Amino acid sequence: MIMPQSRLDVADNSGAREIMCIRVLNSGIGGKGLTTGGGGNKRYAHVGDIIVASVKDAAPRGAVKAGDVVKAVVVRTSHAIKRADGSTIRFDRNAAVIINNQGEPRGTRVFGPVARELRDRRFMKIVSLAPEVL
Amino acid sequence: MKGILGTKIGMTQIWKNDRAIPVTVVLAGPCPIVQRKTAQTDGYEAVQIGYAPKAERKVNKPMQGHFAKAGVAPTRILREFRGFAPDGDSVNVDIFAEGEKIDATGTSKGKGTQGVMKRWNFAGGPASHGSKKWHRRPGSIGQRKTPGRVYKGKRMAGHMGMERVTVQNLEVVEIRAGENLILVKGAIPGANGGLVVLRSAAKASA
Amino acid sequence: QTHIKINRGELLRGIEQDHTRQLPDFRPGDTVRVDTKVREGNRTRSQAFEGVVIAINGSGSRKSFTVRKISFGEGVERVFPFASPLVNQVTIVERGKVRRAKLYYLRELRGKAARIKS
Amino acid sequence: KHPVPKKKTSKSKRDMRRSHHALTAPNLTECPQCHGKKLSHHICPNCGYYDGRQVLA
Amino acid sequence: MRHGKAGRKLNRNSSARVALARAQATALLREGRIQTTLTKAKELRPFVEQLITTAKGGDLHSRRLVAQDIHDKDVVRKVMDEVAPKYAERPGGYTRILRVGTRRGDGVTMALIEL
RNA sequence: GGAGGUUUGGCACCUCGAUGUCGGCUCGUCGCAUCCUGGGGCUGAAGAAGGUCCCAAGGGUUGGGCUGUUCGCCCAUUAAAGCGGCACGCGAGCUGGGUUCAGAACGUCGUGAGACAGUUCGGUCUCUAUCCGCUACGGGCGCAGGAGAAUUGAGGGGAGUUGCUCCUAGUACGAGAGGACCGGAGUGAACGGACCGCUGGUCUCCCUGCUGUCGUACCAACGGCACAUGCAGGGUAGCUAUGUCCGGAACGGAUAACCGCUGAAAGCAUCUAAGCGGGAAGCCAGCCCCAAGAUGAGUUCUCCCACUGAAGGUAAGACUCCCGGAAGACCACCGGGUUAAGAGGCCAGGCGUGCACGCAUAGCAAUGUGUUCAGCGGACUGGUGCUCAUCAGUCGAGGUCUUGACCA
RNA sequence: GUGUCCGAGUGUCAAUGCACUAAGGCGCGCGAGAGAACCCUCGUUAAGGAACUUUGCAAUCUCACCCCGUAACUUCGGAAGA
RNA sequence: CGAGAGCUAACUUCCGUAGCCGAGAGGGAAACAACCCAGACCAUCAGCUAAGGUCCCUAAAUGAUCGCUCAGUGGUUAAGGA
Ligand SMILES: CC[C@H]1OC(=O)/C=C/[C@H](C)[C@@H](O[C@@H]2O[C@H](C)C[C@H](N(C)C)[C@H]2O)[C@@H](C)C[C@@H](C)C(=O)/C=C/C=C/[C@@H]1CO[C@@H]1O[C@H](C)[C@@H](O)[C@@H](OC)[C@H]1OC
Ligand SMILES: [Mg+2]
Ligand SMILES: [Mg+2]
Ligand SMILES: [Mg+2]
Ligand SMILES: [Mg+2]
Ligand SMILES: [Mg+2]
Ligand SMILES: [Mg+2]
Ligand SMILES: [Mg+2]
Ligand SMILES: [Mg+2]
Ligand SMILES: [Mg+2]
Ligand SMILES: [Mg+2]
Ligand SMILES: [Mg+2]
Ligand SMILES: [Mg+2]
Ligand SMILES: [Mg+2]
Ligand SMILES: [Mg+2]
Ligand SMILES: [Mg+2]
Ligand SMILES: [Mg+2]
Ligand SMILES: [Mg+2]
Ligand SMILES: [Mg+2]
Ligand SMILES: [Mg+2]
Ligand SMILES: [Mg+2]
Ligand SMILES: [Mg+2]
Ligand SMILES: [Mg+2]
Ligand SMILES: [Mg+2]
Ligand SMILES: [Mg+2]
Ligand SMILES: [Mg+2]
Ligand SMILES: [Mg+2]
Ligand SMILES: [Mg+2]
Ligand SMILES: [Mg+2]
Ligand SMILES: [Mg+2]
Ligand SMILES: [Mg+2]
Ligand SMILES: [Mg+2]
Ligand SMILES: [Mg+2]
Ligand SMILES: [Mg+2]
Ligand SMILES: [Mg+2]
Ligand SMILES: [Mg+2]
Ligand SMILES: [Mg+2]
Ligand SMILES: [Mg+2]
Ligand SMILES: [Mg+2]
Ligand SMILES: [Mg+2]
Ligand SMILES: [Mg+2]
Ligand SMILES: [Mg+2]
Ligand SMILES: [Mg+2]
Ligand SMILES: [Mg+2]
Ligand SMILES: [Mg+2]
Ligand SMILES: [Mg+2]
Ligand SMILES: [Mg+2]
Ligand SMILES: [Mg+2]
Ligand SMILES: [Mg+2]
Ligand SMILES: [Mg+2]
Ligand SMILES: [Mg+2]
Ligand SMILES: [Mg+2]
Ligand SMILES: [Mg+2]
Ligand SMILES: [Mg+2]
Ligand SMILES: [Mg+2]
Ligand SMILES: [Mg+2]
Ligand SMILES: [Mg+2]
Ligand SMILES: [Mg+2]
Ligand SMILES: [Mg+2]
Ligand SMILES: [Mg+2]
Ligand SMILES: [Mg+2]
Ligand SMILES: [Mg+2]
Ligand SMILES: [Mg+2]
Ligand SMILES: [Mg+2]
Ligand SMILES: [Mg+2]
Ligand SMILES: [Mg+2]
Ligand SMILES: [Mg+2]
Ligand SMILES: [Mg+2]
Ligand SMILES: [Mg+2]
Ligand SMILES: [Mg+2]
Ligand SMILES: [Mg+2]
Ligand SMILES: [Mg+2]
Ligand SMILES: [Mg+2]
Ligand SMILES: [Mg+2]
Ligand SMILES: [Mg+2]
Ligand SMILES: [Mg+2]
Ligand SMILES: [Mg+2]
Ligand SMILES: [Mg+2]
Ligand SMILES: [Mg+2]
Ligand SMILES: [Mg+2]
């Protein structure tokens, strides 16, 4: 569960380290890139939901510097996620990974395992770069 | 229309194919056909049938004679199903087939006298930023002088519980025929072991 | 509330037992679940969780165990029902000495020296 | 704050309020093994028998 | 609500609930009968029956399991060597209540508890 | 030219033996001059996105930074971030930031005491609800006999939102880029009900570990106090969300703007003047819940009958009391009450804890191993007559009359 | 509220502190049930972490002793338990 | 009714004038100090009338005759249109 003010850790090498969320969305991956809408009142990003955020600390030398507005997608809840079989997964630390408005990541490689729900939301590009799913 | 009575037993895990699902086990045991109400002799069409036999020593005489018209053992519960005209006795197998939607009606669990934050999802009010309605309290209750009224219908502390509740489009997961059990997808209301009734969907949506 | 004379317990257990499988007795040492996952489109795939077993919960169909790994730097944990069809097989790797049934302290430790005894 | 009642309450409405304070006479019943009366599911105060003699006195 | 919980506070805290149970145990074991309020007697019966069945094991473990609740040694010997072997034949149900009726001061309905 | 009364006002009518005032918070409900959604007309409407007007109030209308703010600005989203009323709704509901009591300081005015609706720090918001009104829960009585149980629904409520994607179909349209109506399939969001199998919360003495100090003679082993659990570590049943399942709907009817059929008054034309058909998230019905104190008191099935002198023993049948209950403040409801598994206990199983005491051994010892998947035990599932539901008591029908029909 | 004097022990760097307790003294002159809403003093809390709000107000968090290490600035003492 | 002041606003304010109210009961105007009728000495289970009325509430013609409006106009305005 992501909410505004919840800092998350970037899952890529785009060159920010920490991004405080500022909105949950409700759009997926469409054929015109990312979708719009879904209703604008949802209040919890779970794994595989897009979420605007302000970058808080970044790396010196970086595509993304500090303070910039960026749409991340989330790959690592501390909260549990539960499959259609009854598995549960949880990760010690929350983590997200920045993107551009087509769903393509903005870093070279994703860093640490991503949830498999990303595969359910046709986020193919992110999950290609990821050392493990689950 | 078609329906039967039974008792909620408990909840469980289940695997249809590989998808784990929560089912609820009702026991819909055989029901005698006590009284066949027809509009030509009762003004409306219905059937009344029984569940959970009662020891004949515990019956009143009038109820022994009510059942005794029908050749039926005393049963602690009788109920009526509108538009329903079976034959013999209402076994649960014959009434249901696996996967069909069935409304599930039972009596909600009585939680007694409940506040507004619990009963109506009220907001609460700060738990530290000054008050002494720290939680719980409904706040204001009306306008002012014009309508001096507080609206009829107004939501308030009260008996949150014990309501009859219907729950729509539950899915028959499985039918054990010779046990008179019946699995239903997801939850039904009640304390365990309360009466409940299973019926055809009130709205057969496409 | 109807008042049948009924064993609620054996009634449940009779339908909860078709859906109960048993596997290798343990609790708290390290383990490898060889699971299927098929979310890969239509084709099927294996995948391997190996971590400490930190808890045992449930019975019959509802029984489920909790295993904890560190994969690529980040800690991971997971709850498998013993009954789950997407859990093909489970093998131990080594028995652990442990004074206690839960091992939630492993969450706070996350070092090499925060191991399980042999 | 400080609610108070408005108009003094009348004799009649007061009595309708007290309409429920009627006391309920105990269902007394005489001891089979003695003279006197005894409360049901208790020992006879006078004799002390609940079936033999149960209390001392 | 208590839609399944079990017990009673007796208008007191945890340690008080506890000493009261332990000490009325000690008394009705010391003395075979006592008279006390009807509530508190219904309270006492399952406690003290559990305890006599603890003492029905014979063993040093059973006597130490009783010694923890009954810290006057002489009652521990009574319940252990005198009373539990007596109830040897009894499948549970080592106590009864009859109700003596109502007290004057507070208008409580007191009762007797014996074995 | 009108309308509405939400603004700044005017006026001074009730209120100075008191009508608490701005903002927030909490609850809401209403209007419609309609922010979204639905149905339309015209369009400088190809398509798509629009403009603007008409009908439409069922529901819905986001979260943050700035300031006491309302407002406004901005962030980032949205189907949309509607406008007002209800003492600028709501302090016997809450705050107390603003402003408006005493302190003090600054600027400005005054020779001075002092001052400005200029500023700045600070500054007591009163346990007990009679009535009406509102949510719950009983008692009495009524319903032309006395009773157990099932019911019809007069008539009352709740619910009512929508986005996105896909198919149709890259078709109609379009030079092209773009790109549909209608119909069909799916998937979320927020909200609601229920539920506790799952994921977790908590479970104040169910199990364990820890310290100090007392105490059980001492050692061992335990208890007490360290909170009203000493602290920590887990935690079953219950209760619960962030957790699960369900929902909004379709079909129907009459309708608003609108669109038409037949068609005159005027041998044309015209949806109307007689007549008829089509048309909305709205009205009625349809879904779920209440309900015959619907004194208009309803129906059906069954039982006891016709007793003795308004009364009294009584039948059918309730209650009192006892024991309890996923029922509850009390009441009430549900179960059992000896032709009895109602609860307790006891036994077996479940689940929680995690290897008890003691003894053996290892080792200077701290401690380690075995016996020991041990020991212990709240609420869980069943059995079992070991304990309590003993004895009893109390109440409870003889059914008015008139008219009409059917029977000897 | 009320001036002066004496005020033991165990442990804890120390102490008249804190916890348990000797002596001594007392359970505070309505009780008993029950385990609704609400209210007061409290314990734990998923995920998030100040989003709350006039203001982080309140409640956390920090906690004693020992060793190491500590800035801008300075009136050379200090800031410093940084 | 006649003026001023006001916006040819006000249950506004200030004068002239008549009447009512103050000090006034009774019938009408659903209700209503001011409007319309009518100034209560007392008593009656008597009669004619005023204003206002005559379908039922609710006393009294579902009165009569020539029309007018098919809008519930009646039972809330205007410029303007038909
Ligand atoms: C009840 C709590 C206090 O409440 C108060 O202080 C409450 C006072 C109320 C609110 C006041 O009334 C208000 O006055 C406004 C100017 C107008 C307002 N409305 C109506 C427009 C009106 O409500 C006060 C002045 C009214 C009366 C009741 C009064 O003078 C009260 C005096 C005493 C009141 C109370 C006295 O409190 C005192 O405070 C000390 C700190 C206490 O230790 C104790 O002193 C012995 C206590 O008693 C004097
Ligand atoms: Mg910038
Ligand atoms: Mg709150
Ligand atoms: Mg008020
Ligand atoms: Mg009004
Ligand atoms: Mg009124
Ligand atoms: Mg924990
Ligand atoms: Mg007050
Ligand atoms: Mg008390
Ligand atoms: Mg035992
Ligand atoms: Mg007054
Ligand atoms: Mg007043
Ligand atoms: Mg309109
Ligand atoms: Mg539109
Ligand atoms: Mg278009
Ligand atoms: Mg609205
Ligand atoms: Mg409003
Ligand atoms: Mg105003
Ligand atoms: Mg106001
Ligand atoms: Mg203030
Ligand atoms: Mg000067
Ligand atoms: Mg300030
Ligand atoms: Mg108070
Ligand atoms: Mg008080
Ligand atoms: Mg009648
Ligand atoms: Mg109806
Ligand atoms: Mg009514
Ligand atoms: Mg469509
Ligand atoms: Mg709910
Ligand atoms: Mg649990
Ligand atoms: Mg010792
Ligand atoms: Mg010990
Ligand atoms: Mg002590
Ligand atoms: Mg002490
Ligand atoms: Mg604990
Ligand atoms: Mg329709
Ligand atoms: Mg028409
Ligand atoms: Mg039609
Ligand atoms: Mg709809
Ligand atoms: Mg009689
Ligand atoms: Mg009862
Ligand atoms: Mg009974
Ligand atoms: Mg007996
Ligand atoms: Mg039983
Ligand atoms: Mg040992
Ligand atoms: Mg317990
Ligand atoms: Mg049992
Ligand atoms: Mg038997
Ligand atoms: Mg000294
Ligand atoms: Mg000392
Ligand atoms: Mg010392
Ligand atoms: Mg001290
Ligand atoms: Mg003294
Ligand atoms: Mg005392
Ligand atoms: Mg507290
Ligand atoms: Mg928390
Ligand atoms: Mg943090
Ligand atoms: Mg805020
Ligand atoms: Mg602050
Ligand atoms: Mg301040
Ligand atoms: Mg503070
Ligand atoms: Mg320097
Ligand atoms: Mg220095
Ligand atoms: Mg320091
Ligand atoms: Mg003028
Ligand atoms: Mg005037
Ligand atoms: Mg004047
Ligand atoms: Mg005068
Ligand atoms: Mg006069
Ligand atoms: Mg007059
Ligand atoms: Mg009038
Ligand atoms: Mg009149
Ligand atoms: Mg007057
Ligand atoms: Mg007058
Ligand atoms: Mg007037
Ligand atoms: Mg006139
Ligand atoms: Mg006349
Ligand atoms: Mg006349
Ligand atoms: Mg008349
Ligand atoms: Mg005109």
PDB file of C-alpha atoms (C1' of nucleotides) in Angstrom, chain G residues 22-57:
ATOM      1  C1'   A G  22      12.240  -5.230  58.376  1.00  0.00           C
ATOM      2  C1'   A G  23      10.052  -2.766  62.391  1.00  0.00           C
ATOM      3  C1'   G G  24       5.865  -0.376  62.640  1.00  0.00           C
ATOM      4  C1'   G G  25       1.527   1.010  60.334  1.00  0.00           C
ATOM      5  C1'   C G  26      -2.687   0.354  56.932  1.00  0.00           C
ATOM      6  C1'   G G  27      -6.756  -1.716  52.747  1.00  0.00           C
ATOM      7  C1'   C G  28      -8.506   5.025  52.481  1.00  0.00           C
ATOM      8  C1'   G G  29     -16.723   3.525  56.614  1.00  0.00           C
ATOM      9  C1'   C G  30     -21.783   1.502  50.715  1.00  0.00           C
ATOM     10  C1'   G G  31     -21.667  -3.000  48.828  1.00  0.00           C
ATOM     11  C1'   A G  32     -22.619  -7.091  45.143  1.00  0.00           C
ATOM     12  C1'   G G  33     -23.228  -8.439  39.935  1.00  0.00           C
ATOM     13  C1'   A G  34     -22.672  -7.623  34.865  1.00  0.00           C
ATOM     14  C1'   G G  35     -19.311  -7.368  30.949  1.00  0.00           C
ATOM     15  C1'   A G  36     -23.912  -2.418  25.620  1.00  0.00           C
ATOM     16  C1'   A G  37     -23.312   2.771  23.456  1.00  0.00           C
ATOM     17  C1'   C G  38     -20.489   6.765  25.448  1.00  0.00           C
ATOM     18  C1'   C G  39     -16.533   9.011  28.898  1.00  0.00           C
ATOM     19  C1'   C G  40     -11.824   9.106  31.920  1.00  0.00           C
ATOM     20  C1'   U G  41      -6.453   6.687  32.905  1.00  0.00           C
ATOM     21  C1'   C G  42      -4.042   2.989  29.984  1.00  0.00           C
ATOM     22  C1'   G G  43      -1.382  -1.534  26.793  1.00  0.00           C
ATOM     23  C1'   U G  44      -0.325  -3.340  21.688  1.00  0.00           C
ATOM     24  C1'   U G  45      -0.993  -2.101  16.488  1.00  0.00           C
ATOM     25  C1'   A G  46      -0.497  -4.081   9.149  1.00  0.00           C
ATOM     26  C1'   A G  47       1.136  -0.975   5.527  1.00  0.00           C
ATOM     27  C1'   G G  48       2.309   4.713   5.359  1.00  0.00           C
ATOM     28  C1'   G G  49       4.854   8.177   8.521  1.00  0.00           C
ATOM     29  C1'   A G  50       3.019  14.487  10.213  1.00  0.00           C
ATOM     30  C1'   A G  51      -0.371  13.155   5.053  1.00  0.00           C
ATOM     31  C1'   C G  52      -3.156  15.670  11.013  1.00  0.00           C
ATOM     32  C1'   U G  53      -3.415  20.584  12.452  1.00  0.00           C
ATOM     33  C1'   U G  54      -3.151  27.485  14.040  1.00  0.00           C
ATOM     34  C1'   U G  55       1.105  24.802  15.710  1.00  0.00           C
ATOM     35  C1'   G G  56       4.127  17.525  15.824  1.00  0.00           C
ATOM     36  C1'   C G  57      -0.379  20.282  20.672  1.00  0.00           C
TER      37        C G  57
END
